[PDB]
Enzyme design. Structure first.
Site, PDB file in Angstrom:
ATOM      1  N   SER B  34      33.726  12.322 -50.539  1.00 28.45           N
ATOM      2  CA  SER B  34      34.463  11.945 -49.311  1.00 28.45           C
ATOM      3  C   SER B  34      33.432  11.528 -48.270  1.00 28.45           C
ATOM      4  CB  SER B  34      35.333  13.074 -48.888  1.00 28.45           C
ATOM      5  OG  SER B  34      36.148  12.662 -47.813  1.00 28.45           O
ATOM      6  N   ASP B  36      32.713  10.775 -45.276  1.00 23.94           N
ATOM      7  CA  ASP B  36      33.336  10.914 -43.942  1.00 23.94           C
ATOM      8  C   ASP B  36      32.264  10.750 -42.869  1.00 23.94           C
ATOM      9  OD1 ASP B  36      35.888  11.064 -44.938  1.00 23.94           O
ATOM     10  OD2 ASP B  36      35.832  13.229 -45.110  1.00 23.94           O
ATOM     11  N   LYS B  58      35.393   8.003 -51.723  1.00 21.69           N
ATOM     12  CA  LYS B  58      36.594   7.984 -50.876  1.00 21.69           C
ATOM     13  C   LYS B  58      36.172   7.620 -49.458  1.00 21.69           C
ATOM     14  CE  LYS B  58      38.747  11.719 -49.289  1.00 21.69           C
ATOM     15  NZ  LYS B  58      38.869  11.317 -47.866  1.00 21.69           N
ATOM     16  N   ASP B  89      41.422   6.280 -48.332  1.00 22.29           N
ATOM     17  CA  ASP B  89      42.311   7.453 -48.129  1.00 22.29           C
ATOM     18  C   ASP B  89      43.203   7.179 -46.915  1.00 22.29           C
ATOM     19  OD1 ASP B  89      43.215  10.116 -48.609  1.00 22.29           O
ATOM     20  OD2 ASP B  89      41.534  10.986 -47.504  1.00 22.29           O
ATOM     21  N   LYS B  91      46.528   7.063 -46.680  1.00 23.74           N
ATOM     22  CA  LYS B  91      47.732   7.866 -46.541  1.00 23.74           C
ATOM     23  C   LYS B  91      48.885   7.059 -45.925  1.00 23.74           C
ATOM     24  CE  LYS B  91      45.568  12.380 -46.613  1.00 23.74           C
ATOM     25  NZ  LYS B  91      45.677  13.727 -46.072  1.00 23.74           N
ATOM     26  N   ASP B  94      54.774   4.853 -44.054  1.00 26.48           N
ATOM     27  CA  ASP B  94      55.748   4.097 -43.236  1.00 26.48           C
ATOM     28  C   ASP B  94      56.774   3.486 -44.179  1.00 26.48           C
ATOM     29  OD1 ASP B  94      56.928   2.705 -40.981  1.00 26.48           O
ATOM     30  OD2 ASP B  94      54.911   2.690 -40.024  1.00 26.48           O
ATOM     31  N   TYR B 209      39.440  25.905 -48.098  1.00 27.94           N
ATOM     32  CA  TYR B 209      38.604  25.557 -49.270  1.00 27.94           C
ATOM     33  C   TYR B 209      38.878  26.473 -50.457  1.00 27.94           C
ATOM     34  CZ  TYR B 209      36.177  22.444 -46.109  1.00 27.94           C
ATOM     35  OH  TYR B 209      35.882  21.460 -45.208  1.00 27.94           O
TER      36      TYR B 209
END
Ligand SMILES: O=C(O)c1cc(=O)[nH]c(=O)n1[C@@H]1O[C@H](COP(=O)(O)O)[C@@H](O)[C@H]1O
Ligand SMILES: O=C(O)c1cc(=O)[nH]c(=O)n1[C@@H]1O[C@H](COP(=O)(O)O)[C@@H](O)[C@H]1O
EC number: 2.4.2.10
Lengths: 256, 256
Positions: B34, B36, B58, B89, B91, B94, B209
């Site tokens: 990830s 990030d 990701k 990612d 998500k 809608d 976690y």
């Protein structure tokens, strides 16, 4: 039932909700334009022409082909001129740590220009906590998605009750709902309803429509969100006026 | 239970899942990084150094301060070089008509560079229909969010069962799940699990976690998604190797 103007003065009202409710009563509008366009020039020409007819302009900044923060500067100028709020329909739906960065940062810097954003409640209250750590200091508000307009929506029963509880436990930041109906009995909370057209129907991808009279008058919502019913019309100003007059009269007739 | 390599050959396997499962077995990795981070240079230096250790990178393209489509061109070069998939990612959550534009268009053009995206099931199957109208022609895959790692998640019970049914009814496009566990009994479907660290704990905004041994070995998931457990470490390469070896051994021990 209180008028929008009286709701604007409720002791527990959020400042963003108060500002909205005041301009709704001043302008006799409970219409939110869903400005679902891909060109900045079209977004700004709609905001200028329809600004007087709307209480709110809802954006999907992520479908705009020529997004720049300057486009949003021009949108804020129109929002101030014509008196409407900007609602970025981002539907935040991640863990709190992620949504705080999605709200404040990246290319869009949503919190810098959006009066309102919305969030799904499915991740739990961390989504609201994360957003509020950016939004509270920037004097913003949030709507929680308690019900959805689309076929097969799972936002029903206990889900909708969880959205209402979450909103009510975070009233410092949450100012209302995206819903199909009045879901909260507390008048400090706005109800905004998408899936609205004058005529019966839907789209090919699960959208379902109800009329302004049904959702404002019978279902007790406050504001209609209208996209294609206006955007696809030839004369978007007259379409906006038809939706405005429909939603406003439905509101007045429920007040009695 | 089949190996990743055997699952890659299942008659009903999606091509994106097959590609992923092949490179997982070739590289002995079931780790998704990830990434990030807010700087393109950091994203690309992580992708280059950790590429050999991961099956998937990701992204949250909307937290990158210096996003350009060229950054994603450089990421694809690394993905091809080191053999990993790119998972945005996003998500999506809608109505179908909106998510198709969010997936194809705007500044990010997600479908042009992302092998995989994910979607919430709360709006109903229109979310998948809308995405698949862009993703099927562009040979992409989608993951449905069946369970979430965050405190107060409403993705439990009937919700998780609805996500599994939706995936199974759209197998042309849906290749698996974001989940905490094996939720589908069909081996053609990938299970990716976030909320993973070696040590017990959480964050201040509802993240929880579990260890790689717990989620791969005991809960039967396929892939761990790890952000801060790697990203916040001093030596991100050795952290990635620790997570890779943990997830890979947990997988091997479940195979017997
Ligand atoms: O958050 C929203 O506004 C939203 C929620 C929902 O349940 N249904 C829904 O249609 N919307 C949005 O409202 C707009 C509806 O547009 P039209 O169907 O064109 O009127 C779209 O931009 C949707 O993304
Ligand atoms: O879709 C996801 O990856 C996701 C789903 C979920 O249930 N939980 C979850 O943490 N994530 C994401 O996975 C990552 C977790 O990062 P760390 O908590 O730093 O390991 C974040 O980027 C989240 O946005």
């Amino acid at each position: 039932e209180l008028s929008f103007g009286a709701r604007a003065e409720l002791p527990r009202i959020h400042p963003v909700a108060s500002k909205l409710l005041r301009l709704m009563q001043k302008k006799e509008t409970n219409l939110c334009l869903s400005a679902d366009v891909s060109l900045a020039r079209e977004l700004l020409q709609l905001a200028d022409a329809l600004g007087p007819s709307i209480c709110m302009l809802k954006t999907h900044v992520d479908i705009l082909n020529d997004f720049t923060l300057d486009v949003m500067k021009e949108l804020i100028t129109l929002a101030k001129c014509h008196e409407f709020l900007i609602f970025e329909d981002r539907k935040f739906a991640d863990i709190g740590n992620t949504v705080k960065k999605q709200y404040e940062g990246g290319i869009f810097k949503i919190a810098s220009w959006a009066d309102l954003v919305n969030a799904h409640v499915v991740p739990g209250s961390g989504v609201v906590k994360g957003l509020q750590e950016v939004g509270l200091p920037l004097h913003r508000g949030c709507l929680l998605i308690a019900e959805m307009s689309s076929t097969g929506s799972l936002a029903t029963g206990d889900y909708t009750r969880a959205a209402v509880r979450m909103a009510e436990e975070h009233s410092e930041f949450v100012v209302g709902f995206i819903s199909g109906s009045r879901v909260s009995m507390k008048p400090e909370f706005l109800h905004l309803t998408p899936g609205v057209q004058l005529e019966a129907g839907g789209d090919n991808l699960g959208q379902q429509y109800n009329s302004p009279q049904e959702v404002i008058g019978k279902r007790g919502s406050d504001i209609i969100i209208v996209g294609r019913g206006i955007i696809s019309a030839a004369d978007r100003l007259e379409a906006a006026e038809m939706y405005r007059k429909a939603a406003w009269e439905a509101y007045l007739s429920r007040l009695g």
